[PDB]
Design a protein around this ligand. Sequence first.
Ligand SMILES: COC(=O)c1c(C(=O)OC)c(-c2cccc(F)c2)n2c1C[S@@](=O)C2
Ligand SMILES: COC(=O)c1c(C(=O)OC)c(-c2cccc(F)c2)n2c1C[S@@](=O)C2
Ligand SMILES: *Cc1c(COP(=O)(O)O)cnc(C)c1O
Ligand SMILES: *Cc1c(COP(=O)(O)O)cnc(C)c1O
Ligand SMILES: [Cl-]
Lengths: 425, 429
Amino acid sequence: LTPEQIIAVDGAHLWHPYSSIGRSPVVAVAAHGAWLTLIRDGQPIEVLDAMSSWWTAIHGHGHPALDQALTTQLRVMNHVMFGGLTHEPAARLAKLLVDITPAGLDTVFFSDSGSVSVEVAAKMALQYWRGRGLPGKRRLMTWRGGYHGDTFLAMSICDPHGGMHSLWTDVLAAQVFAPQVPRDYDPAYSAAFEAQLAQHAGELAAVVVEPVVQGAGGMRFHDPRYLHDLRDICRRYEVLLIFDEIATGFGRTGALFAADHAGVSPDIMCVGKALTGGYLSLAATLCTADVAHTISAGAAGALMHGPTFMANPLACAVSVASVELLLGQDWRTRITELAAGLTAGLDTARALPAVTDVRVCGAIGVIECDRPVDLAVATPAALDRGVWLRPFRNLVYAMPPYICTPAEITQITSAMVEVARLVGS
Amino acid sequence: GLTPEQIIAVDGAHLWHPYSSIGREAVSPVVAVAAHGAWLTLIRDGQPIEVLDAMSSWWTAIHGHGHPALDQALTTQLRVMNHVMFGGLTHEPAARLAKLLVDITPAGLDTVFFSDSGSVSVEVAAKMALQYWRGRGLPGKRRLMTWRGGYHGDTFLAMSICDPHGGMHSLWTDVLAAQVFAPQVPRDYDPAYSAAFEAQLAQHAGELAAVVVEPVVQGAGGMRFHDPRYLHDLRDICRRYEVLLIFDEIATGFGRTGALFAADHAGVSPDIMCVGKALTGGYLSLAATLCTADVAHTISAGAAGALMHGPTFMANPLACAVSVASVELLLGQDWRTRITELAAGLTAGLDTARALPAVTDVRVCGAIGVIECDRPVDLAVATPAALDRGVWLRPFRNLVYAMPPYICTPAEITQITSAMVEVARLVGS
Ligand SMILES: COC(=O)c1c(C(=O)OC)c(-c2cccc(F)c2)n2c1C[S@@](=O)C2
Ligand SMILES: COC(=O)c1c(C(=O)OC)c(-c2cccc(F)c2)n2c1C[S@@](=O)C2
Ligand SMILES: *Cc1c(COP(=O)(O)O)cnc(C)c1O
Ligand SMILES: *Cc1c(COP(=O)(O)O)cnc(C)c1O
Ligand SMILES: [Cl-]
């Protein structure tokens, strides 16, 4: 199909994320390394994938080690049902994940998406307490500003304004919300968290939060010491702690997992997005031996979940290679250099009239503006500078692939500054 | 690099399996090391043996594993573009697949929403239905109705419309949404059942967003078949009481029941439709939800202005590419003849099971064969017995059943059915 044919089919038949039908998307024809080939005015152009294709492409696109791992597995076994059978890609990836995740996370449940992995995490927590004779422990607690997925349980712990909990009035589970976690450490926030949690301890299965960085809820950072507090509160009140690392995982925040900034091990952990280096959909939910054994000795004798494509060989194979590629290099220095690039490149944005904040955490760079960013202005402006940038609400932000050179980062940040300049005029 | 023994050891310590435990598994899982065509290579007594994939790897491998045309589709896309975000971008594999899917599904399904799994597509379908009525100023229309015996996924909303016994709702007291359940749909057509379904719906109509059913074949809820005419009655009931109709074709789609989609048996179109499982020919997780123009427009003109859903990997180019090849490969051959031949093979080969003491039923529908027994089938007896005969079979509850790849030869079906018959014999004693 020609680009124009793609556009016509797309307008008539394709739903996009969080969009309408009939209300225009740009045709993508190739991706290699940190670059996308986009069709603009009928002409192909090379642009930097500053978004990492939504947090996903940590090693860039078409990485030879990830391409090879995919075709190698494809020669041997595309997929087998995980009911009654096991295989090497599942075992290799499970061993990897157990070894590099915070200590005590010994078991691995594979699924096909972040939202599903979160539903699995919530299921683990509910079955765990049912295994302990305490079925009253069934609500969830989080702080505001969060995002945990699009499925209906997941939605219930998303920020009530963010995921607009009306028009979902009498539809979502009614969960417990503490106020927005602030950027700077404040003992009084944690004390209030504890006091509110104390009021619901007997009905709470778990606290679920994104550690250090809150992503789709507004690219906010908080002090990792709150995570230390969350761990202590959850211990003392016997509530499980769940870390949603679907966005933060695999080095993105400057640590291998964001939990590491605090030295904290959650009881349950979700990963996804960068898991496969952005080739294929995959997610994982990990829990402690204790959680696993308590579920398994319960009335059900099992975790009552099992996606059809569970532990798909092809997805697991590329993920193994993506993880090994990350571990086998000096990823910490890579991420540190990237953060300094973002920091230096975004400095001048602080002086712009419409800019309220500039913040960087690992390979995450954020220009917070004073009004919603108009995509009809922002997207073509960044395309003009040879960069794929998609703003969100009042945020001009980037999360570049790790393979981006210093020059490419500076090109990304320039385009971000120029986009921010345009919002102000 | 891990050997079979190393794999078993890592797996027992660290891997969850579907609906399983950690550390309390009666039988260790079997190491699979290869899959080609209709055969899996599995490790038994430390030795690689080839056995028939009677299950199509849980309905997925319709064209079999490692099919040259699907392999090629995947490798070709890989050299060009692995993935891009579907926010603000579109691409050729998404367009091509959507166009195919719109053309080949029941008339009136004009828009396609891609996701990563069957359960997610069901939640999207529900979200479509609910947002639809909110767009009509009827936010009270928010509950779902179904008939018992069904399966729709394992995410929490999907769980709420699964059969209350099959889905173990007893373990979920006041966690799940309370939905409206009609009695088990009978095999044989009885208009009394439809009339009672309508009366039950009529009293809930003002609070129902949608009826959600598996058309013709209920899969994970007990492999039950029902007369297609019941779907014709649902369409009529939903039309007259203004309640949307959702067909869950995640198991039934793409030729499995002898028609392209199971709805085609009844000649009826749902308002919203889910597909998955066989979509990519079993290569990769991919699902879709389709809806009519009216559903799409009403959602879009509503207060929210958009469908509030968007999986990160939405419309993945690799998954979409292999799916296009899988759909085209099915459409490019006489698939209807193939499924008729398969069904005949399944019938002839399973017939002697009807006489078996422990067998209550033998039933075939397209490329699906089922032996229902009068008691649960012991996996520790059945699995070794089928392997011993060169067949991968996994019984469920009291059922011994198969959904073989469409590429199975008559001799392969003979071999599949013989193993099934035998498993059934051992259930006697
Ligand atoms: C209640 O349904 C099931 O028990 C089930 C299931 C299963 O039987 O796992 C052994 C499986 C299953 C899932 C993945 C692989 C496999 F061999 C079997 N699945 C289901 C639901 S269908 O969506 C996926
Ligand atoms: C409220 O969150 C979102 O709006 C959102 C989103 C999006 O902004 O798509 C336009 C996307 C999104 C999803 C797929 C591709 C893409 F570019 C963006 N996603 C989310 C949720 S994150 O889990 C997936
Ligand atoms: C992206 C994301 C999810 C959802 O993942 P999908 O694969 O899009 O379902 C859930 N939680 C967090 C924190 C995320 O960043
Ligand atoms: C398999 C199935 C689902 C769920 O699909 P997953 O990919 O396992 O989440 C939903 N509905 C029906 C009818 C199915 O057969
Ligand atoms: Cl052979």
